[model samples]
Structures are given as C-alpha cells and as structure tokens.
Target: GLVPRGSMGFKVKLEKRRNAINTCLCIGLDPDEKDIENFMKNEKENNYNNIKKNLKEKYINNVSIKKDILLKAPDNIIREEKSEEFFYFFNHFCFYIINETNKYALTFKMNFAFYIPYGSVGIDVLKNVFDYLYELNIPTILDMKINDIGNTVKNYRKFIFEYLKSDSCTVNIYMGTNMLKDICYDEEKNKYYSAFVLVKTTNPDSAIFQKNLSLDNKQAYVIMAQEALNMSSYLNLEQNNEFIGFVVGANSYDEMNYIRTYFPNCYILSPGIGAQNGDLHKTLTNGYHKSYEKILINIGRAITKNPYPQKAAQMYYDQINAILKQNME
Candidate 1:
C-alpha cells in the first residue's frame, strides 16, 4: 500500500548496476516444485527445528491452536501438509538462492504464478522478499504479464507499484496500445515505470501467433516492438531511461536483431536460456543496444537447478563478460 521512494528511477539504477556487473544476467526465481521437494527433504530436519523455534517464540505461552492462527504461522495452513512443506521449502529455497546470486544477478525476475497458489501467506512472502531485494539495491521484476484496462488497470498499478513496491513488471501487449498507454505510465511519480512488453515469447508455441504477419506485412513481434518504442515517446522518461522494453525470445536471432533495430535504447528481456537450449551467444550478439548493453538474458533452470547457485551465476557472468570483451576487441 506504499509506493517506494527513490531518488533515481529503476532504469537508471539498473543501468548503473548492469555496467558495474559487466553482464546482462537476469536470474529468474521460478522455483521448481521437484527441486524444492528435494531441497526440503535434505534440509527438512534443520527446517523443522527452525520452524519449532519460530512457533515457540509465538505460541509457547498460548494453548489453543486455532486454524486461523496456524494459517498465519510459518507454514501454509490453507492447504494440506504437503502444501505446508512446499511453502517452507519455497521460502527457504528463495532466500538461499537470492543470498547466493544477489551479487552476480543484475536483476531478479519472480514469476507471480509460483506464489499465488499459496494464497495470502504466499503473497506476504513475496512482499517481504521484494522488500529485502529493495534494501539490497537489487531491483526485481514482477513477471505478472498484467493485461487489464480502466480502473482494473489502476488497481493493478497500485497493487504492484504501491502495495508491493516492485521496481518493474511485465505487461501483455496483446490488449493493444490502449492497455499499454494506461498501465505503462506511473502517474503518481510522474515517471514511466519499467514495464517489459511481451512481444516474441520464448516458448515453442509462440510461433503460432508471434511469427504471423500483420495486415501491414510486418511480423506481429515487430509491430509490438514498434508500439513499445512509440509508447516511450509520450511518457516522461529521462533521456537515458528505458521506459519501455520488449520480451523477445532468446531462440530467434533474426527477430531479435530486427527488434533491436527498432529499440536501441529500450531494454530487451531475453528469456529462454540454458534449459530451453537457447543460444546465449546469438541472443546477446544481436540484442545489444549499441551504446548501452540493453539485453538481459534470463536463465532459470541452468542456474537454479545447480548445486551451487553462486558458482553457476559466476560462470554465466564470466561467460557474458568474455563475450562482450571479445566483441569490444
């Protein structure tokens, strides 16, 4: 219910960090249930001890264990025991990975669907986690793909910007520029919010629509990319601020390059690396903004599934730096 107060905007801070890190790695924090199950099994005894300690602090003095009270406890009480375990595993796993990858990850993208299933308690975790990331000066993108209009859009804005204090979010561009026009601008702050418009997605099924040509004989992605760039013009974005960005899949080299031509300054969220067998080389090669390194290649499973997230992140960071260094030479 509060908008985050910041001297510099999200884009400015991201640019500064991206330059400092010398990598465009945006780690996706989409927790895999199976991975969480394995992690919980290994760490169950330890977590049980921790959970007991937490419970003692709260309910050691009280006798009656109401369902509502337990609902607000350390685990998921709305669902069954398995769900409770999943909740604990998820909460612990996120903190562990964030602690490990915060230094190397330029930004963290948390897909909302992962948390929404657990209901209010899950959302509370997301809020607290986001606040922690904010404290660390590491911005997070709420990959909600919000698609709404009018008052609904306004509420969505408040829920994300005001309630969660999220630094950025993903917007579905299928609803047209009207949706983009309403949701992209942060009127309260009088500055454009960092919103990534979904253009060419990375999934196999994306070609069904994104690859199709419009009546104007241009690709759908290209049309959306153009719209994103156009939307920036009407916003109060600073000269260096990337108000609008497009979510272009990492698998398509030609389409990525074509979109980059249209958006030299806009940010490019290049998802579908590692697990999806996305070509990291071509994804980074064509999507660069020339003057500024504008593409953030999101790696989910490759880094997350590894034993040591820090090591995986560092390896990716080094690889990207090497590529950029070689390109500069």
Candidate 2:
C-alpha cells in the first residue's frame, strides 16, 4: 500500500541510490530473540515506563532523530496494559535504527526467517517496516532464500511484491536457474524486481559442495555463476550489472577474485563482512570491481547489536570508503 511507486524498476533504481549515497553498506534488520526477552523482562507492569525511559535517553536528547518519530510514537500514548503490545516493539526497534543510521546506509535488508517466528504478527511487522522504507525512499531487499517451482514461487513472489512491497528478494539456485527468467523481468507485465542469487555463501561447510569439481573441471560455484550471467544477458539486464547477481561471501577470497575478474558484469552482495569475519580490505581487492560498481558489503549484528548503532554504522561507512580510496590509488 505504500509505494507512491517510484519512476524506475528496482534494478535501475538501486543503481541510482547506491551512487547517490556513495556507499557500499547495507543495514540489516535481523533483531535478536533476546530483544523480545528484554521487552518482556518485567511485563507484569506491561513495560510501559521502561519503553519511555529507553526512548527518552536515546532520542529525546539527541537532535539527530526525526521530529515525527516522537510526534507519531510518543511512548506514554499507550495506557493499555495488553501484553500483545509486545509485537509493537519490533517495529519500534527497526524504526530506531532506520532513523539513527538513515544517512549512512545504501539499503536496508530484512532476513525473512528472523521475523517468521512471530507468526501472523510477523508479517505485519515486515509490512510496517517496508511501508516506512517506502516513505523514506530507501530500497529494501527481503532475504528469504526462496527457491521452488514456478507455480509455488509465484505465491512467494506475490507475497513479496504485492503484500510486502519489497524492492528485491534473495534466492538460492539449488533447484536450477530457470526460475530466474520470470522472477525479475516480466516483459508481458512490463514490471521488474531483482534478486541476489546465492552462489558461494559464508557458511564454513558450504564449500564441500560449492567447491567440488566436475568432468568439465568447473567448480559448482562457477557453473552457477555462469548460468546466472547467461540469464542476465538473455533477459537484457546485464547492462545494469544487476541481472542475476551472485551472493558470494566476503571471506571467500579465491571465489571472489575469480568472480570479480571473469564475471565482472555481475553484482556481488557479500554478507560475511563483520561478525562473520570477512576481511574488508581483502574483500575490496577480491570482490569489488572499480569500473562496473555493484558490490554490497553487509554487516548485520556488528552494527545492530552494538549499544551505539549510529556510531557503528558510521564507522563502517568510513571504513569502506577509506578502503576504497586507498585501494583505488
């Protein structure tokens, strides 16, 4: 219900936003389960007073926060003692980060599994966040790892595109790459969305299969990467460098180097940058392409888990640009 609807498709719009911000950082919205525990820490009082105390200390004194945040979400407005209000905390936590780190982020990512456990309320949480992002004109990627037959995935697509209004979704190509055909570009409907295909993930054991070889001597990751490239050109999205982008881990040095050089046309969304121990400096030389440009480095817990999220986000922004500047010269 929120997108007054932008002028360009997701892929094209993504390019513009990244350039405008001059950033490679993507803030992630994967709230910790302990947050729920903390919210309900003393729920016999329904935690009203605590919520007010927390917000006032964090925002009321900080002029950096948006005026409307307090106007629309004054903590004392709710006198109702229902425990169901626990769900409201998720949205607030997300909004807090969005407002605090808004200037530094290139995009905001939502990990689907993180919210699904909240049951029906989870969807509402995602919807509210998407609506908020839409209003701010920030693009969001729903990290769902969705992969299935065309018919089944149709429903997944509808849920993300129609209900959540997400700009893009993450997909695992274990089944094959054909599904990507209609996923992003729809010539018939003249509509487009984009995806980040998982090729070499950050998981430690994943290389057991991803690095395995075949008769043709191509590694599993290479085959998948090649197919993604083929589909990108076939669909005419290669020019955007988004096409069927690959999700290579920031720590996967050899794979990153190979993909960045041989497959320079594709975008790389690397997730292992911070908590996952991905080397940022090495990632710059390995995964990042100077001329082609669509490389994303995502650090979730490192920023969100910190007591100082705004500082953490700014630190990362400076670090990435610093590395880029030094590397370029």
Candidate 3:
C-alpha cells in the first residue's frame, strides 16, 4: 500500500480523472444472464436490426466497389449466427452503457467471470469493449482475480496488458506475488499496469476466513495489505510504486478504516454499493488515502441494469458528490 510520489501510472491516471470529474464512481460492466434476458425483453426490436446489417454489409458496399471473393467464413463465422447473435447483444448493451455512463465514471471495472460463459463470442466481445474504451481514452480494470504461477502469469500479462490493453486488473494473491512481478508493468511495451490485489471481499461468506487471525495476530485482510506493502518494497522500482492497489469491499467498515489509516498511500477499490445495499456514506466516510484522497466505489446493476443507464449513473454521481461534500464539511 505504499506509492512513490510523482507516480506516473494508472493510479495517477485514475486520480487525475477523479479530481477532474469530481467523481469516484467506478462503473462495473459485469452483466449477468438475467440482465441479458431483461435487456432483450425491454429493448426495442431495432437493436436486433443492426445485427442483420453487419451480416450482409461485409459482402455489399455503400457504393458497390469491393473486390469479390466467396470470402470463406472462419469457424466462428460459420457458427456466427450464434456468435454474431450474442456479440450483437453484448456489444450493443455494453457500449450503450459505456457511452451513457463514461462522463460520470472515474474508470470502469469489467469482470471476465460474467464474460467467459458466452464462449468465443464472449472473448471477441471483450476484445471489442477494451478497444472501445481505449478509443475513448478511458482506463479499465479487468477484474479477473487472476492467480497463477510465474510462467502462466507471463501469458496472463501478455494477454491482459498487450492483447486486451487493460490499464489494471484485480488479482488474487493466494498463489503468491508472481503475478505482481510480471503483470504490474511491462517495460517492453512501455505500459504501466496497476494490480488491485483482493484483500477483504464483500460477500455473505467472506468472514469464513478473512476475519480469522493471521500473522502478527491481525486479520487476514490486514495481513494481505501488509503483503502488498512488502511487495512494493520488494519490487523497488526505480521510478514509482503506484502500480499496486487493494480491493477492499465497502461492507467491511472496520477493516476498511484500518487499511485507510495504516496503508494510506495506494488506491482502495471499494465495491458492494447499490445492488448489494452497501451504505455508500459509511463505506466512504473517511476511507481515502491521506495524500491521494479518492476511493472508487463500483456500482453494477444498480446503474446499468436500469431502463436508463445514464440517469442512474448521473444520480449516483450526484449522490456521491453530495455525500462527500457533506461529510468533508
């Protein structure tokens, strides 16, 4: 949880955006199957029409000036009735939410968990979404909770950093800090990646182990935070140490305060608002780094699942700002 001053990386990127927009809202792009069903049912038929246009437009042109070949479709293309069908819904859905909400979001958090189930179309859709965010000059966290060995982490880094072009990602440190060493930054690509290590999570069963005593007679989360600091020291990058952050859920108030008080340098990604009924005020009351005072609160369905994502996002943006103003005063 230590950050070198003048850190020129994703953390600074997020901080600049948060101050510029006066918002700490990190919109979650994790859409579930139920949301899909509801979106299809609620959205207009015209949404589906665009899918048909892409299918044919590849063959004919606006001016009919393209060289003609059978253009043998690939495997996904042959099965693309299914591929394009799913891709159409997700691309349209996510982009609409992104377009409508980006003005209010400090950054976006997208989880691959909700994505992979859709198969190849799922991956193709992810590629498109990340590229779209880059096109808009927005940063993102691919919340994969990626935990793996050193060699595996190499591929993970190349894929998430090089291929997907994510600015950061949520990583599970259970397997160890191998991920941090590789994925945090890539000197070759000249890219800086922030890794938000999972500490105290927000869920019904989190207490099963996170609250248990660990080294130094501290809770697991505190221990996890300590490990992150240790990693920062070990990494010992010559330029900066803003590449590390932690994932502390809003539901853990005491643990959050403890982390905020002690590990008061790195960013704390506090999720569990809106749909989870997390107390937005209590969650953020004083849970910011003393130096870099901003905590990103991620809200998923509560915003995107609404009939109108823009309105919902703006409402949260307003509520959060008012809360911060009142509390800080």
Per-residue CA lDDT of model 2 for 1-329, tens digit only, reads 33344555666667677778887788887887775555445332554454454455433332222333333343433445234454556656676677778788888988988788868766666777787787677878899989997767877777887677788889887797878865776546656667889989899987888997543888999998888778777777745434567899988999999998887667888898778888999987787666323788888889887767899999999999888777676
Better of 2 and 3 by lDDT: 2
lDDT of 3 by residue, 191-290 (tens): 5566789888999788878887576688787877788768766676424525677888888888788888887666788989988988888888857542
Instruction: Report the C-alpha displacement of residue 302, candidate 1, in angstroms.
Output: 1.4
Q: Taking the tens digit of each residue's C-alpha lDDT, what string does model 1 give over 1-329? A: 43353556777778678777767889998876676776666555554443444343322232222323333444343244654555555665676677778788888998888778757756766765676576666767899999976557877777777777777899987877677656666566664667888988888888888887574788788887887777777665545354777888899888888887765666888889889998888888888754343788889889889988889999998887776766666
Q: Report how far off residue 104 is in candidate 2 (Å).
A: 0.6
TM-score on alpha carbons, each prediction: 0.83, 0.85, 0.83
lDDT score at residue 196, model 3, on the 0-100 scale: 85
Flag regions of model 2 displaced more than 4 Å.
1-5, 39-81, 186-188, 213-215, 238-242, 291-293
Ranking by TM-score: 2, 1, 3
Residue 36's lDDT within candidate 1 is: 71
lDDT of 2: 0.74
Q: Which ten contiguous residues of candidate 3 have the minimum total lDDT?
A: 63-72
